Amino acid sequence: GMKFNEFLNNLSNYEPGKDIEVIAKEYGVKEVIKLASNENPFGTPPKAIECLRQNANKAHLYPDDSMIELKSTLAQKYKVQNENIIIGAGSDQVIEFAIHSKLNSKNAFLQAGVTFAMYEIYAKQCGAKCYKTQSITHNLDEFKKLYETHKDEIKLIFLCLPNNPLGECLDASEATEFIKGVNEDCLVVIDAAYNEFASFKDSKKHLEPCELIKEFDNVLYLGTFSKLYGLGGLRIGYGIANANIISAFYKLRAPFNVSNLALKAAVAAMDDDEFTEKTLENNFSQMELYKEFAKKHNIKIIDSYTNFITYFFDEKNSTDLSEKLLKKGIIIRNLKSYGLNAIRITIGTSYENEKFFTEFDKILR
Amino acid sequence: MKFNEFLNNLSNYEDIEVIAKEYGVKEVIKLASNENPFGTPPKAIECLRQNANKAHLYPDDSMIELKSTLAQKYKVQNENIIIGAGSDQVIEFAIHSKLNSKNAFLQAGVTFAMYEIYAKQCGAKCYKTQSITHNLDEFKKLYETHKDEIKLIFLCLPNNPLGECLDASEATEFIKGVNEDCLVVIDAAYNEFASFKDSKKHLEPCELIKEFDNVLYLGTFSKLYGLGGLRIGYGIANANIISAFYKLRAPFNVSNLALKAAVAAMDDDEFTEKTLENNFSQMELYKEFAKKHNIKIIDSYTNFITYFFDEKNSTDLSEKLLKKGIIIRNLKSYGLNAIRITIGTSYENEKFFTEFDKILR
Numbered sequence: 257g258m259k260f261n262e263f264l265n266n267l268s269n270y271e272p273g274k275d276i277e278v279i280a281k282e283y284g285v286k287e288v289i290k291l292a293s294n295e296n297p298f299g300t301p302p303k304a305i306e307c308l309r310q311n312a313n314k315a316h317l318y319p320d321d322s323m324i325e326l327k328s329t330l331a332q333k334y335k336v337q338n339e340n341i342i343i344g345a346g347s348d349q350v351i352e353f354a355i356h357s358k359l360n361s362k363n364a365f366l367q368a369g370v371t372f373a374m375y376e377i378y379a380k381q382c383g384a385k386c387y388k389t390q391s392i393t394h395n396l397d398e399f400k401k402l403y404e405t406h407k408d409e410i411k412l413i414f415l416c417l418p419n420n421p422l423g424e425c426l427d428a429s430e431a432t433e434f435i436k437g438v439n440e441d442c443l444v445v446i447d448a449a450y451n452e453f454a455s456f457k458d459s460k461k462h463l464e465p466c467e468l469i470k471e472f473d474n475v476l477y478l479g480t481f482s483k484l485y486g487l488g489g490l491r492i493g494y495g496i497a498n499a500n501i502i503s504a505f506y507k508l509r510a511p512f513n514v515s516n517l518a519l520k521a522a523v524a525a526m527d528d529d530e531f532t533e534k535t536l537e538n539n540f541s542q543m544e545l546y547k548e549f550a551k552k553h554n555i556k557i558i559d560s561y562t563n564f565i566t567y568f569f570d571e572k573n574s575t576d577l578s579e580k581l582l583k584k585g586i587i588i589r590n591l592k593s594y595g596l597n598a599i600r601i602t603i604g605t606s607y608e609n610e611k612f613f614t615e616f617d618k619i620l621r
Numbered sequence: 622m623k624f625n626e627f628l629n630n631l632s633n634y635e636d637i638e639v640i641a642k643e644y645g646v647k648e649v650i651k652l653a654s655n656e657n658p659f660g661t662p663p664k665a666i667e668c669l670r671q672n673a674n675k676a677h678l679y680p681d682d683s684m685i686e687l688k689s690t691l692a693q694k695y696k697v698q699n700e701n702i703i704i705g706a707g708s709d710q711v712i713e714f715a716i717h718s719k720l721n722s723k724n725a726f727l728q729a730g731v732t733f734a735m736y737e738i739y740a741k742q743c744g745a746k747c748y749k750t751q752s753i754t755h756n757l758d759e760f761k762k763l764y765e766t767h768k769d770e771i772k773l774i775f776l777c778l779p780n781n782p783l784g785e786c787l788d789a790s791e792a793t794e795f796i797k798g799v800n801e802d803c804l805v806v807i808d809a810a811y812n813e814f815a816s817f818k819d820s821k822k823h824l825e826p827c828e829l830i831k832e833f834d835n836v837l838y839l840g841t842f843s844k845l846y847g848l849g850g851l852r853i854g855y856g857i858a859n860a861n862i863i864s865a866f867y868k869l870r871a872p873f874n875v876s877n878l879a880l881k882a883a884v885a886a887m888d889d890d891e892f893t894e895k896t897l898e899n900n901f902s903q904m905e906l907y908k909e910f911a912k913k914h915n916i917k918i919i920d921s922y923t924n925f926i927t928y929f930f931d932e933k934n935s936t937d938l939s940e941k942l943l944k945k946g947i948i949i950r951n952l953k954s955y956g957l958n959a960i961r962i963t964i965g966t967s968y969e970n971e972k973f974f975t976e977f978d979k980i981l982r
Binding site: 258305306322441514 | 622623624625628631632633634636638654656657660661665666667669670673674675676677678679680681682683684685706707709710713717718719720721739742801802804834835843847848849850851852861862864865867868869870871872873874875876877878879882
């Protein structure tokens with residue numbers, strides 16, 4: 257019969273489940289409040305909305321594959337050259353390029369004890385070994401020691417600054433201190449998907465791509481339009497790195513990998529400073545409410561530099577709490593899949609956050 | 622820094638509309654990318670405008686609304702469907718699921734460039750028939766000779782860039798002799814057009830996957846459905862093939878707006894009829910022009926027509942056209958002294974005939 261490549265044997269059967277919002281609606285909830293995907297609670301930036309509406313009648317045209325308008329906009333913003341940029345269908349696709357360009361069945365990659373699920377999932381295709389620090393949060397010392405130990409094997413390192421799903425963030429200077437001791441043939445992938453948020457809470461967490469690639473030839477900085485820029489549905493993100501790394505990724509990238517609407521909307525999103533400032537300011541003032549609520553209910557958290565907060569439990573069960581929330585129309589992210597007895601709550605609008613606090617307070621009694 | 626050795630087998634990465642602005646053109650007529658000349662289906666245009674303020678939301682990764690719409694249209698089950706970032710992405714899944722450095726694929730002498738380009742990653746052998754056009758007999762004989770090696774076959778029905786199309790019955794006849802461990806990829810990107818010209822060219826997915834458990838049907842929203850800019854296409858196949866692909870597909874591989882717009886596009890039957898009808902009535906003008914200018918063509922079942930030259934050179938002709946603001950596709954890259962012209966609106970096609978007539982003098 258029909259067989260496939262052996263590497264597919266290493267992959268898990270994948271059936272996306274029934275949408276949780278559909279479920280909640282079938283349960284007859286009063287209202288559905290979604291705080292589970294780290295989306296912008298204010299929606300799509302108004303300049304992007306308009307851009308999209310004006311470009312709705314251009315949906316039939318293949319995009320300009322050079323992607324010169326968005327590359328130039330990114331190059332100007334970060335003060336790098338166009339040859340240092342690649343655009344992916346989400347930053348996820350750039351992680352894929354990185355993995356496929358460097359990992360294979362005879363080598364390995366390094367990451368924090370608990371960080372973004374997709375790193376290891378994408379790496380499974382290559383059959384590369386995954387090394388994780390004991391510390392679940394990113395720790396400079398642990399990274400140095402685990403890397404040195406497997407220095408001949410590790411060809412790709414992930415630093416999620418700040419970290420999804422925990423929320424912590426190493427200082428930029430600690431990251432650069434670590435990267436200085438990494439071999440030139442090992443690619444350091446800095447996932448900066450939420451770094452705009454971290455930078456806003458504390459400048460010491462801010463990463464500067466032009467400085468990173470000028471100092472380190474082996475660094476790839478990843479950014480996205482999905483979170484702060486409120487374009488998660490469009491699937492567009494980017495990588496910044498030495499030209500040699502970008503040139504290698506361009507051998508793997510399919511032409512027309514990003515939509516013409518996403519290219520246009522990303523440019524508009526970057527020019528809507530009032531929206532992004534509104535988003536950042538709401539994120540951290542509302543996060544205070546979350547910290548206060550946890551404190552009042554004796555709930556452990558990790559102080560966060562992202563657009564979410566994570567609540568950890570002991571005697572109570574995160575699965576049970578998530579189902580109870582879901583039955584009141586409140587959709588959060590259960591971290592059981594990460595091996596944690598915890599929930600991750602995306603910081604929503606003040607309305608959304610108040611509903612979470614109202615129902616959860618009831619549930620915890 | 623070094624990379625995986627397979628990247629050594631890949632070519633280094635190397636806008637005509639901008640060169641037209643650079644050359645100094647007032648109006649640019651684009652007939653090079655097989656796009657719908659009437660634009661985006663109006664129900665899709667309204668859908669996109671209405672969902673412009675939902676661009677911040679990740680799509681439903683189950684993609685149940687579009688899968689169900691396709692399942693209903695084609696009378697198959699949701700488990701037989703995969704959605705890709707264009708049908709191109711489904712080609713990638715197929716190649717990555719089956720090809721490797723120790724096996725091979727089969728295709729026509731001249732067909733879509735991306736098949737071979739995508740396969741370079743896997744380092745697989747490419748077998749091409751002597752005939753540049755798809756030929757049942759050559760396919761049978763070449764497949765039989767290399768039966769132990771061929772694990773993927775491409776059938777482009779109708780064919781880009783030549784325009785020809787085997788009858789469905791011939792395709793079926795061929796597939797019956799193909800081994801159960803060889804995946805047959807039927808690229809039906811342009812089959813709506815072929816079907817309209819001649820029902821003998823029509824492919825019916827529910828019948829294909831019922832009769833064959835090694836067939837993958839590929840369709841797209843990029844051509845007839847006028848959504849080429851959004852990147853959304855699909856594959857229909859036996860559940861086991863789709864399951865394998867689902868192991869390779871990244872979650873959220875298609876945008877939420879694309880999912881919505883594809884569903885709206887399939888409910889605009891007046892727009893698609895208008896497109897098909899225009900396509901073939903206008904194609905007749907291209908046939909007459911060629912005939913009048915002693916230009917060899919291949920009778921076409923797609924949304925384009927291909928003109929072949931002898932004494933004249935397709936590169937020089939393409940440049941001359943470009944200088945007049947008319948953008949067509951030069952087929953020199955395929956090794957042919959030919960141009961492929963997408964059938965545009967009556968206004969676009971008239972501009973082409975008027976300028977090209979002058980260029981040929």
